[PDB]
Amino acid sequence: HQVLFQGFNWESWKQSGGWYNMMMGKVDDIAAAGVTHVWLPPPSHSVSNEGYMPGRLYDIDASKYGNAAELKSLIGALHGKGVQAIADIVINHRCADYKDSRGIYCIFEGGTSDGRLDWGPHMICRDDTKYSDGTANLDTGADFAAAPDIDHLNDRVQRELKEWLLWLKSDLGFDAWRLAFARGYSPEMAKVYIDGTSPSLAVAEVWDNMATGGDGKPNYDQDAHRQNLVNWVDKVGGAASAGMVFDFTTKGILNAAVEGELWRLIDPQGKAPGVMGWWPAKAVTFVDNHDTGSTQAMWPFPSDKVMQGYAYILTHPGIPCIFYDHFFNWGFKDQIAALVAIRKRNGITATSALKILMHEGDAYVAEIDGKVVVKIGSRYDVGAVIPAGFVTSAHGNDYAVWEK
Numbered sequence: 013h014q015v016l017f018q019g020f021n022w023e024s025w026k027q028s029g030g031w032y033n034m035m036m037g038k039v040d041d042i043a044a045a046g047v048t049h050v051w052l053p054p055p056s057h058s059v060s061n062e063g064y065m066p067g068r069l070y071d072i073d074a075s076k077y078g079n080a081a082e083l084k085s086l087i088g089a090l091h092g093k094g095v096q097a098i099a100d101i102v103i104n105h106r107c108a109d110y111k112d113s114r115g116i117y118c119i120f121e122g123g124t125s126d127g128r129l130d131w132g133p134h135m136i137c138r139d140d141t142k143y144s145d146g147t148a149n150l151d152t153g154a155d156f157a158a159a160p161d162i163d164h165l166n167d168r169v170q171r172e173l174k175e176w177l178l179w180l181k182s183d184l185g186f187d188a189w190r191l192a193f194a195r196g197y198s199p200e201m202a203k204v205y206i207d208g209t210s211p212s213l214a215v216a217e218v219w220d221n222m223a224t225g226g227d228g229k230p231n232y233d234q235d236a237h238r239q240n241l242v243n244w245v246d247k248v249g250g251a252a253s254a255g256m257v258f259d260f261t262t263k264g265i266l267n268a269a270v271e272g273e274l275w276r277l278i279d280p281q282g283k284a285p286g287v288m289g290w291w292p293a294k295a296v297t298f299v300d301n302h303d304t305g306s307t308q309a310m311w312p313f314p315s316d317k318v319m320q321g322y323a324y325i326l327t328h329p330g331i332p333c334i335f336y337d338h339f340f341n342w343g344f345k346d347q348i349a350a351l352v353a354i355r356k357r358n359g360i361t362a363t364s365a366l367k368i369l370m371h372e373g374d375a376y377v378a379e380i381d382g383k384v385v386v387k388i389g390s391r392y393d394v395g396a397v398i399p400a401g402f403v404t405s406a407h408g409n410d411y412a413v414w415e416k
């Protein structure tokens with residue numbers, strides 16, 4: 013059994029009294045709902061309020077979300093209830109506290125009295141000429157325009173970041189990682205940090221654009237998109253590696269599918285169309301995160317159909333990740349909990365088997381491990397598709413789950 017929970021949204025830093033402090037009162041509900049891991053925001057000093065422009069990595073007290081004591085307290089609370097903590101690791105780029113003699117912000121400060129992470133432009137990818145001094149290696153991946161991109165091929169860089177990551181585990185209690193903007197460096201580099209820090213899991217955010225048509229809708233065939241994702245996992249170490257990826261393929265298809273196009277939910281081989289259908293053990297599914305949803309809303313799930321999104325990922329192969337707002341703010345708390353309960357009770361895991369029973373525009377029906385049947389869609393009556401022995405146990409707007 014494994015169910016993730018993103019424990020913050022894009023407005024969290026703003027929480028009166030501190031975000032971690034407020035999360036303490038949510039721990040028991042999260043644990044009781046069957047969550048096994050909670051993904052927490054980037055914990056260090058950041059030039060940006062949300063934490064995605066990290067500077068003094070060791071300076072946890074400067075975080076807008078709360079300080080080290082407050083963070084350790086939350087992680088300890090989660091651990092007391094048997095839930096693990098995943099930290100949002102932002103290492104593609106970094107902001108330097110000080111300017112060099114060129115007036116460029118490229119002299120770093122790790123946040124400790126000694127020289128840990130006190131880098132210079134020599135650690136900035138040479139091709140990021142907005143900040144580099146031309147001496148470093150070429151960036152192993154994509155660039156982040158608003159800040160210096162780090163040269164992960166630099167030995168001191170690899171050594172000091174691994175040192176830092178191990179301190180997050182030993183000093184704050186983090187168990188695992190969420191690799192922010194993993195397209196920014198190669199899978200080979202991600203392997204260095206993953207293999208060198210032994211996380212219970214390392215879920216990478218590898219976000220590639222999805223193929224779409226002239227009408228704006230994603231193509232039915234998204235094999236190229238999930239292929240990129242499995243190729244990343246292969247390169248990071250495959251089955252032996254703790255690394256895995258967010259299933260953006262499933263997110264994109266699902267966004268469009270629920271709009272009366274549920275025939276999109278099966279590929280020509282009879283399998284789920286996203287990463288879930290090719291390497292479920294490595295696919296972390298989700299309805300929305302702080303980027304696609306929340307106040308950023310870069311690619312929100314159709315608002316009136318969110319529970320169909322959860323009826324899908326919570327009963328299916330892959331590792332589902334519940335979004336904070338959906339659980340505590342949309343009034344779906346009991347319904348989501350019931351779905352997680354059905355998943356756990358029937359022993360459904362990331363590798364459970366999926367047998368699709370119906371895949372028409374307004375009706376998708378699937379059977380998992382021969383023990384659960386789920387339906388989503390605007391077509392009310394699918395009773396002729398339900399196998400004998402199955403009784404309904406959860407249901408709401410345009411979705412229903414049976415157990416037999």
Ligand SMILES: C=C1O[C@H](O[C@H]2[C@H](O)[C@@H](O)[C@@H](O[C@H]3[C@H](O)[C@@H](O)[C@H](O)O[C@@H]3CO)O[C@@H]2CO)[C@H](O)[C@@H](O)[C@@H]1N[C@H]1C=C(C=O)C(=O)[C@H](O)[C@H]1O
Pocket residue numbers: 059060062064065156157158159191192193217302303308
């Ligand atoms: C203040 C910056 O705001 C913008 O960048 C944001 C971005 O819009 C957010 O979506 C967020 O992106 C992160 C995702 O949330 C996360 O899931 C993913 O894993 O990682 C990305 C980051 O790679 O956060 C970023 C960074 O805060 C905007 O695009 C950016 O230009 C802007 N930076 C400006 C402000 C500065 C402040 O000192 C300058 O240093 C920058 O040069 C300037 O452009």
Ligand SMILES: C=C1O[C@H](O[C@H]2[C@H](O)[C@@H](O)[C@@H](O[C@H]3[C@H](O)[C@@H](O)[C@H](O)O[C@@H]3CO)O[C@@H]2CO)[C@H](O)[C@@H](O)[C@@H]1N[C@H]1C=C(C=O)C(=O)[C@H](O)[C@H]1O
Pocket residue numbers: 387389391392393394395396398403404407408409410411412
């Ligand atoms: C048990 C059913 O659960 C789901 O149906 C929802 C439906 O989508 C909602 O729109 C809502 O409809 C009710 C209206 O709110 C109400 O005003 C109206 O008077 O009555 C309707 C009917 O209840 O609520 C229902 C219930 O949550 C799901 O989408 C739907 O497919 C499902 N029906 C299945 C259950 C059965 C038992 O094995 C069979 O009776 C059906 O054939 C089967 O499809």
Ligand SMILES: C=C1O[C@H](O[C@H]2[C@H](O)[C@@H](O)[C@H](O[C@H]3[C@H](O)[C@@H](O)[C@H](O)O[C@@H]3CO)O[C@@H]2CO)[C@H](O)[C@@H](O)[C@@H]1N[C@H]1C=C(C=O)C(=O)[C@H](O)[C@H]1O
Pocket residue numbers: 239242243246250251281283289290291293
């Ligand atoms: C479990 C494997 O997942 C990945 O493999 C997928 C391929 O990348 C993808 O191209 C392939 O496409 C085929 C489809 O299966 C068919 O539906 C289609 O009709 O024909 C396509 C022809 O290629 O689908 C693969 C998934 O079925 C990884 O690339 C691969 O390395 C993975 N195997 C790993 C992991 C396990 C399972 O834990 C080990 O037992 C394997 O030995 C190891 O190699």
Ligand SMILES: [Ca+2]
Pocket residue numbers: 121122123124125126127128130
């Ligand atoms: Ca220092």
Ligand SMILES: [Ca+2]
Pocket residue numbers: 105140155156157158159160161
């Ligand atoms: Ca850059």
Ligand SMILES: [Ca+2]
Pocket residue numbers: 104151152153154155156161162196197
């Ligand atoms: Ca980069």
